[PDB]
Amino acid sequence: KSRGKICTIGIAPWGIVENQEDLIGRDVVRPYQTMSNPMSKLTVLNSMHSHFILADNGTTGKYGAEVKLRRQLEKHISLQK
Amino acid sequence: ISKHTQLSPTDAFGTIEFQGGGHSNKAMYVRVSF
Amino acid sequence: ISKHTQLSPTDAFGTIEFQGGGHSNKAMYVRVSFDTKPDLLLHLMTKEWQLELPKLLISVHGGLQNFELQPKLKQVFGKGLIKAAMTTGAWIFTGGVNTGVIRHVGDALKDHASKSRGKICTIGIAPWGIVENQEDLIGRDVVRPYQTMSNPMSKLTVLNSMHSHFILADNGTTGKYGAEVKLRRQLEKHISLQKINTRIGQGVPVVALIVEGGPNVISIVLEYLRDTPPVPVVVCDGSGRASDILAFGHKYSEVTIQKTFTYTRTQAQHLFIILMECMKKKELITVFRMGSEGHQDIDLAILTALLKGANASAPDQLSLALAWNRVDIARSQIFIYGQQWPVGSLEQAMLDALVLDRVDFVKLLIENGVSMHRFLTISRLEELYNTRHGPSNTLYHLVRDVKKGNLPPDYRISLIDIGLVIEYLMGGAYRCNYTRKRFRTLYHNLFGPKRPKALKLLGMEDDLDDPEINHFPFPFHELMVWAVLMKRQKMALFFWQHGEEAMAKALVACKLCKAMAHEASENDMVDDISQELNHNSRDFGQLAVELLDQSYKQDEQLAMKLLTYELKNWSNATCLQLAVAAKHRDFIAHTCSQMLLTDMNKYLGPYVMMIGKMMIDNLLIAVFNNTFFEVKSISNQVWKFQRYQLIMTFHERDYGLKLFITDDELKKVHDFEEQCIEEYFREKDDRFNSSNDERIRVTSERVENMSMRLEEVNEREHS
Amino acid sequence: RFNSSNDERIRVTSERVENMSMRLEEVNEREHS
Amino acid sequence: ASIAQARKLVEQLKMEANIDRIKVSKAAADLMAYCEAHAKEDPLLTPVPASENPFRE
Amino acid sequence: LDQLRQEAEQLKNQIRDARKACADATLSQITNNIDPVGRIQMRTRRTLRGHLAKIYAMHWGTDSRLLVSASQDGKLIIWDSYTTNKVHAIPLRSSWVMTCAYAPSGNYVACGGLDNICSIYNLKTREGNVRVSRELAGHTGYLSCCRFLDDNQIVTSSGDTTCALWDIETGQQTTTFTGHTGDVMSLSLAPDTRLFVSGACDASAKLWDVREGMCRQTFTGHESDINAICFFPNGNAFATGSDDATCRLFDLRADQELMTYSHDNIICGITSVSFSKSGRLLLAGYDDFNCNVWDALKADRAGVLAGHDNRVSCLGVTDDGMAVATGSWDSFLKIWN
Description:
This is part of a larger assembly, with four copies of chain A, one copy of chain E (57 residues) and one copy of chain F (337 residues). Chain A has 81 residues and is α+β, with helices and mostly antiparallel strands.
């Protein structure tokens, strides 16, 4: 509909994506596959994104380990001028 | 266990390219602790 | 008497010419027995009447009276019926007399025939003795004119006009019913027994459209529901007759008191004994009503009616709609949340879409996650080159020319021969990747174990790990190549808008179109393929020039650097050389092309060419004065085109011809090119959408819709 | 070609707009409140 | 769906496993009894020049 | 009802299990005494010079004096083998015929191939010209190889998983040999005329018994398409030629492999193979330009007979075993001895 790259930021825990693999390449390009199977309980990362954050706590497949970091991030943004 | 984790360095971060979809989406991705 | 008939072979069959209406229509008729088998019927239809299998069968049952329903209510039915019969091949089963809904559908067919072109297979299946003109149609193989003006005295009904095909079931008696129901039902069964081209193994889907009717129509719809292959039933609410009472009875089931309408014999004759089953199968009832709920479009409701009754795998539904070529319905029904596409089905669907040349379906599948990288194999491309489900092409003739015509019957074409044909078209110095020895090894070691079984005797034949493999780093390049080769312009254009190095692809495509047009002109072709290929070459050159100019306006330095690198995909050249071989006047004459030469006389150069175009011929000065401006312009084009040849001649390899840069800068140029082409397409959309005529057309359509909605609002009277 | 010309579209749309305006005035005429 | 095909191999398998597959020591001696007795006539392993041969000029 | 696969699994045991119980003294230890052949060089006698292109098939004449030409030109040229001359030349309707069978008496010739039909031609017509007797339609796979029993009964090899036995005069086929899956490229008759073992794609030969249309034995142990097969003269064995560049000799009356006859330099397939009159020295035509005079009994090569610059496809050994004659794709035919 227009131009420009609107900065969209996503904070996702490490153990919930479908493919923690295929991304291990440090500071390098790794292609991703949009298609996914529903029998896998895990959910892929959102497409049409600008920047992504992979939160981590060690646990895999368990929600509730990302609200704290996001809240502190918004706190420091409030701490910004 | 009570969060018996380790100090392993982050070793999955950078920039990926989105295939399959109608547009090539680029997202700077970084594994990080909480 | 009980069916002891004078059985002689039939001797009346031919054509008619309608008289009385505004359309002179020709219809095919055969009078058969009321005990005829459907086998010879199908033989006659497919062979004699040249009627291929439709992708849909429509069963219509209506009253035999002369009822009338509300105007501005039948219009949506007519629109949906016409759309269904026109968009995809669908045969219509009816009687053919000028009564009931048959007269309505004949009027509808007359309506559309005055709107657009196209033909619709209408099959009139009625008993032979019903009509008054049982005579005047006895002569065989003669066009017998029919008179559509019907006298009021006769209790016999003429055949409704605007009919494509007539079939008459002789009964032994004259002017009675109850002898064509069985034949039509068995024909429907026979068509259900038939198999369509889809590899899923799907028969011909059949709908059951119910309008008006009577108590007998209730028996018919019960038969349709209770058959082992279920027949989905669509009901017309505006009928008022027994079909409409079933539509009313659909709502609020498990009262019976309200149904006591005394249709025949009050509540003494209550057919609830079978209406209980009729409403037991109410999940398959495909209701229809205009002005309420949603999806009031008759054709769209008809199509999805066979979809809810399909009950098969979702890929089967996708294949059926792809054959139907209705991408909107797949967008609507076959693509919803929670689809769980089975593994391997999507690749097969994409393959069959490619072999059927459906750009819209292909783009929808790709938007659903189908990736041409992983989907493409060498085997798939080879099968693409050896199919017959689409337009004609010269490729077999071209191969026979290049490969010296040593072919056996129905040879299976290989990729190496394709590359040989390509290199034959391109020119001398060209060398494709296919002819390279690495491709030779990959083909022989992997793709050639024993695939040409009958060729090993004839002798026309001469791995550790992998990236999945059978993988062309740039699959869209070869896809566009194949699309060009099979002469499919739209798919090639769609491929060209994706990928990288698109301008080089455009130049290559223009050169290929020019060469193929020359080949067509060389060997007594149909004289339209030649000019169509020339038009395609014109379009490719136009796209190349427009992209070049837009990139030049975007930036000058990067655009100058763009025509410099070697083409690791296209026999290792640069865009300038390709345009020279393609002989593109303006592209070479373009501003950026000229200044690109400068890094290696302007005035009097055209002056010499001025006189040369006059050397062929006060009257002379009158010719000279009126033939000077265009000649000057063309001479300028020629000189700006030939400046490259002059520079190379006066020069003659890191520079001088090309420029070589690292891969990272090539990636930067790739992103720059993708940005430029995206900008070009978006600006083209803006320019097309900003024209005043487009706004006028949109305003007209919205005004029409607003007037319809205003009338709809004015229909109600709350006070 | 005749029914796709801009001028015909303008004329038909203008007549439709005039009739629609008069009809909308008729609709607005009834004030039940 | 199709069960006769699986039978078809067995009837070929049953009547074949019991055939007279002779002993390899005895199998050789039958084949061994050929060459040394079939001696004077062969011009291809221990030949003689081409007087009575089929292929001289 | 799937136990039939378990019994076939059970019945698959006895062939190997009895064999390994039986395989106590293979051919390696029985006759190790006989000396290796060493250095024997065979000389070409006649070279049929004058043809145009690759020659695809050849069968000899039953007087050891003649053979039928089958080449890319399409001319079925009845070549005399005692003056390097010919008698008649018969171009076919289609130049793609991949076999030629010769009547055991010497009267007629079968032909077929890409046309998926078999045609028999009357050589000895009263007017002096060869004319086709009749065609044999009924095969949906191309005719790869074929041989007569006599001038009326002919076995044919087809690629549509059907092996046939055609009556000539009637034009009808009484029975069909069904039960072979790999496409049969060559058929080698047993000397009794009542048996034949064939070379097929499924790396399996079968003792197809003629008077029934039924398979007798299982001959498995090769690796790829069996492009060639030759019968051992005494009637008890047969050697095969395949694509895996290896010769694997088996036996009828013991049903076991004998040895391996392969070289590091032989990678290409085997086109045409032939025994000796005693079955001692074994011949094999290959895709490349080097043949070997193998020993199916001792894995010994008498020599390499390289005189053709093109692909070797067709050869024929005399009934009296007096010599061998090889034809290749260089439009020639040569008689090594």
